[PDB]
Amino acid sequence: MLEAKFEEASLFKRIIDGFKDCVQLVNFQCKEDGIIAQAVDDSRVLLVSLEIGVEAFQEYRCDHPVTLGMDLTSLSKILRCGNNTDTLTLIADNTPDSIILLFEDTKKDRIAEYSLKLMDIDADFLKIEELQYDSTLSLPSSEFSKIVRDLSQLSDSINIMITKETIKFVADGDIGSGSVIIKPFVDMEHPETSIKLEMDQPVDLTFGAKYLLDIIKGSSLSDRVGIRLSSEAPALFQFDLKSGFLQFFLAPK
Amino acid sequence: MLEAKFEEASLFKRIIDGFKDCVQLVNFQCKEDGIIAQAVDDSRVLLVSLEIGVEAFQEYRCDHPVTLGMDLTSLSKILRCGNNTDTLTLIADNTPDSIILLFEDTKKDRIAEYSLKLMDIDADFLKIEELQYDSTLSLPSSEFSKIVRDLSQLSDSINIMITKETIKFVADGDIGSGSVIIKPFVDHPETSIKLEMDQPVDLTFGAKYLLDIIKGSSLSDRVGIRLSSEAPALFQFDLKSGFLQFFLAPKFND
Amino acid sequence: MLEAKFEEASLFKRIIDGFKDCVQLVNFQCKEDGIIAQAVDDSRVLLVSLEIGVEAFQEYRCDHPVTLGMDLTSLSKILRCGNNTDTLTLIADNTPDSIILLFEDTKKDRIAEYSLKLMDIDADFLKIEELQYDSTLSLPSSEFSKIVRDLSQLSDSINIMITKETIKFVADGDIGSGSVIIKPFVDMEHPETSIKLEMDQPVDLTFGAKYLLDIIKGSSLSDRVGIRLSSEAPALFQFDLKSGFLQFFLAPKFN
Amino acid sequence: TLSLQLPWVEKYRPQVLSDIVGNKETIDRLQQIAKDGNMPHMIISGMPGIGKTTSVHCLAHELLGRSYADGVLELNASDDRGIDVVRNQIKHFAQKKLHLPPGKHKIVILDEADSMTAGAQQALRRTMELYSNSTRFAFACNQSNKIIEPLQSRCAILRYSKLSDEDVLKRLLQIIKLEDVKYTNDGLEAIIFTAEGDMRQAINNLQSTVAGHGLVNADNVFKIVDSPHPLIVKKMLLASNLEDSIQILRTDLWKKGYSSIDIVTTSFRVTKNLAQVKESVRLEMIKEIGLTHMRILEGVGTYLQLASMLAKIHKLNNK
Amino acid sequence: VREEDKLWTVKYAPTNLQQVCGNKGSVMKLKNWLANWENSKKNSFKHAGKDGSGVFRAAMLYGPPGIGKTTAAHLVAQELGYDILEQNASDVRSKTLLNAGVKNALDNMSVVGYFKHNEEAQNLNGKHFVIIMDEVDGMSGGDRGGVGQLAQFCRKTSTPLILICNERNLPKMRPFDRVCLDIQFRRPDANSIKSRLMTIAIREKFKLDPNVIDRLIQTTRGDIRQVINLLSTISTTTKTINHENINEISKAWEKNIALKPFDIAHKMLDGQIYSDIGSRNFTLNDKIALYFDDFDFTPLMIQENYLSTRPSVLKPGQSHLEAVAEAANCISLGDIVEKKIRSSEQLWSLLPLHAVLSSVYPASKVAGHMAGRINFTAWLGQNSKSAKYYRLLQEIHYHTRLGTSTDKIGLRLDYLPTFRKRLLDPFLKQGADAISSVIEVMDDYYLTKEDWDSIMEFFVGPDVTTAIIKKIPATVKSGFTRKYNS
DNA sequence: TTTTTTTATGTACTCGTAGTGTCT
DNA sequence: AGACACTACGAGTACATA
């Protein structure tokens, strides 16, 4: 029934690499309008929400909302068979017991087949709230991963401040202090690297370092990331490549 | 005495790197014809043979067929220090207690002489017999290596099915299964697949041993695979003057 | 008030990485002529002496001699917080405490302000060693590091022998033995690959493998390293930078 | 000052099995073994400073001749001797090829064998069993009970005993003759008395007295080296009247700077190793000493606690 | 290789099964077990046979070291045509690579048995393997060591599995209790080792008399390897051995092995040791070393079986009850010392004192003859049961906290004697129509069916509900279980 | 005849994700 | 530019303690 012919195995590889060490066993809910994946860690601070539409596939077809449970480690184990010149084709039937993955190469003499056994997991309800966020910023994903991994060295608590149209990332450790200051920049020659900032009221929150370290793992999906800060609601971290996107909802202390 | 001069030390380096993750102690018998080395696995499942002829050395010298017991880990440690553009010379004196390795540079006179202490390998020399094989095929070593690397991630058992001129590599593990189908296509004329199939053969090997065998996928471009229903399969990497063979025994065909 | 501004911010990173493993705490003396640093290993087997003149600092202002005692496992973390096309700024008040690092990007507008708490190291480090050596050689840093890393796998002691136009590095262990012998030549086509050697009397002494492996970590600074050996004297492994040098005084093992 | 001289324990360290004045039986055994060859696996146990490491060193040297450098593998407690070392280095040395005379074998000396972990000791069994025709193992320890029984089953057991007065006196006389030192009978007697069968400690005290005063006399030896700690404690516990024991504890132990923990530990050890009094009274004295030690360890260690301990011991001895 | 280069134990090693000394029954049993192995695999080990060997696919040899377990195993392996393979703790043995190798070798054939000789009519078994594991008790405790991995290996294999260890009944070796056929090699008889020593002495021109091997093997405690090493060590200097120098030889070669916590209890409670004569032979230092051999089970065993002996060291005017009371007082003092030791500040330097107060003094107080049997300490099982009951009571208390508002002990002591009358008593006096009342009472305090089952196990004495629940009609119990499951 | 007993730092092993120099 | 052998530092798991 479910037959989805991927554009390239590397795309699904990256979309799975985005959240390797975040969750283990999850339930992909697949419908006709797209595929949604909701995951909640044990510490109850991040909410992994992955949405991939039909326009992200070279061919996607389905006629029944179904559920596919699986582990992420075995998923990456099957994806490790992928190459750079083969496409992935996902096959699922009316009785969900095993997903069939066909690795097809342009040369029709070498075709690969693999199988993934499903596990049953208690799925969680979708969190798609649009509660108003105080400030909204957009920063290149590589630079954000760099600054996060740099500030994680000093202290395990990263302070984000949005004041006087100046973004401040502070990390006061025991050996010293850390303070990276950035200003809103708009670039006209390279429209992928820019510091976009829209502020309505000053923001000042604290976040866990390992949480941001787990979030920045999705930097391989997109060239830039959108971070929405709010003083009364979980902050949003949004990656988007061309049409499929991933979101982390971090509940601040 | 013995003084064997190589062309490039990288050749011997790759030779040792090929079969150094399966066996540890190897007996190198040097005779007037060349070097012959047979080594049984610690689990006695995979036997490794290696022949290097006299026409593979820049200069060969031998007054008596002499056995040298070598540990492949220390040998790899010694050979790792050399570069790609040196001449390697193995030297052994009377009453062999150690082997000398001369690395001589070609654009300079910098000589690096290393010593390697021999070991006491109380192992019996056995005889290898060639017999008829029901199927004999050849295919690029890198492709077989990637098939093994893809299938070993599910289970440790690899089922080989040669039937109706089709190669079927099956991996039945805990999380699903994996299947690879191969049809012989003879076209570059060098990356072709030459296959002769007489009897449809069904064997089962260990994925770890397959990985240890494909780790030597740097001595040639293709692999010579010879199957047998009641005899251990022969995986061969051909050389300019010798070969590296693995006699891997199949599992119980109950 | 100490105020220094580097031309490239990665030079300080490469310099500190040299001491990162072989030295724990440092005490930078900053004067009007440049920054000096002398440190002793925990086991007190090697002595690190770094000197960087005001030629390296794009800007320099030292009102009075300043002493900055600090830790290297934190300074390296602060330096890795920078960027490849950034500039580094060291600031210290009139009384030395809580040194400030400023990373400023030259392509975009970015300010990274980091702090480092100083430490009160009672042991002074002002000793200078200026004595003639029995042999002075100079060889490419990569060629020396290769031999060191190749002979460190054989044993834990590496013996250096200097004879009449012959440099020998011997290593005898349990799995075998080895010896690399080189001759001093003059290379006209490339000067950075030549090997020079001026000897007064033959030398023969051994070092440990760990300290010799830690020393060659500074090979990423200069393309050529000098080695000064003498009869029972701290061997001088020197990497000369375009504004100063880094010299390791290594102590041999008694036989 | 620029350099020091070698101590007499290291300078006059025996290099031939005849120079050892230890246990005559085991010494002649090892001498005949080195003369004939075929050295078996051995474990030498005893007390510190009686000639265990020197004995095995002399045996290995005499048995290997010039091949000592490449045929003997020395591993002390200062080096890593875990499971990984036994797996890699010891096995590589035992498997190493070496042309030796038809009466010699490669020797693996393991000093302080009582400190090796259980995993390494277990792995050493087959390591010494499969290469018992070209590699031999000699362990030197202080407690043979710390070595597992499977390892002890594959080797000979040599238990070294304390050195009698005559042997240490003869060795000290030889050292004095070789060093031209002025001495006297009472000085040597005091040295041997303070040595307590410890040859290394005896030679060290002799050298220290020589370098500190020049003349080896009982007065000098007593002023530079105090009397043995357990003997004064024994005389204090074996006192018949309470006032005598109290005066001994005050003058000899408390007024000289001996900590209360050391005093109570020495009292416990002496009462444990005592043989003058019966078993029940010894157990009661040990009970009281432990009751006192429980207060000494809690930080209440003073002279009053030791005085009360002595008073309770005397009350127990007071029928 | 020459003759004088091997030890006497190697040149006199058994070359066939007819030269093994003692334990003939064990070697014959293992030989029959290995012979019928293919007869056992052809019917999938369902038929055990008259010998009882054939249902287990693995054999575990356990006994003291140096009696010939490995030797006999290798001998039968070479004699029955099985291709031998050995791996032990001297090689790397972990959960990662050892498991992979052994799994790949359980149902793979041998290339050595194929290439060596496979054309003659020797046996169809040469293609098979025998995985002989030595020093099984030397592996790591946890699962990463591979003891449980090997225990699972002994369940699914197509090749005979041979396990050889020196210490069998250990916690680490618990998984091997019901998976492999156990064979115990015991102390060899004196006649066979006597003949072997006669032969090895007449061969080496060693003068030796038959009167000494008895005391020799007695002090050696059944170890032929140690005996051979002893003769090889002393024969070089003393050419003739007899009843004159045997005392020094026995005193110098005494096997100093730690006793199990059962022999320690026997030696501690032995009245002859504390006599005026035995005191100066087995000194107090040896008595403390006895406890230090195993300082974890000795005090528990002493406290368990100190009042189960007949004392022979009773002072004039003292009864058995007085000595037992003093021993129990010293036991309590030693317990206080042990609590001070195994608590904060780590006062381990008080371990010798705990030797005297806990074990030495109470045993000396009641030393004598053993009336019955040396019973194992029940304090371990009682502590485990008490911990389980405390966990269950904690769950019950945290379930009922919303209504009870009391402590754990306050709920166990007073609330349960009423919960019993509320829950279970309406079942005995009303039948099956009182189920709704019990359900309401349990939901009033958020009780569960498992909680109801655990509640009835706390009462003791005249209230033992273990038979009361059986006296309840099964219809009422089934109705209650079905009602609570809806 | 048969298996657990707290906390406390030192010791030893292993798997283990990770950071970086090297090879088709 | 990239893939993967080599590797060293970090969490886990037990094991003694006179």
Ligand SMILES: Nc1ncnc2c1ncn2[C@@H]1O[C@H](COP(=O)(O)OP(=O)(O)OP(O)(O)=S)[C@@H](O)[C@H]1O
């Ligand atoms: N029998 C002896 N004859 C002569 N000198 C001896 C004798 N025993 C010991 N010594 C001296 O003591 C020094 C050290 O002896 P060792 O053998 O190291 O002591 P030990 O018996 O091994 O006890 P350890 O090492 O503390 S376990 C030697 O270098 C000699 O100077």
Ligand SMILES: Nc1ncnc2c1ncn2[C@@H]1O[C@H](COP(=O)(O)OP(=O)(O)OP(O)(O)=S)[C@@H](O)[C@H]1O
């Ligand atoms: N019953 C026996 N008869 C004759 N010699 C024996 C006997 N048992 C042991 N030996 C000797 O002891 C040597 C070692 O025997 P092993 O079987 O290795 O000892 P073990 O019983 O396996 O105990 P280990 O190895 O410590 S687990 C043999 O080579 C023989 O020389």
Ligand SMILES: [Mg+2]
């Ligand atoms: Mg010693």
Ligand SMILES: [Mg+2]
């Ligand atoms: Mg054995």
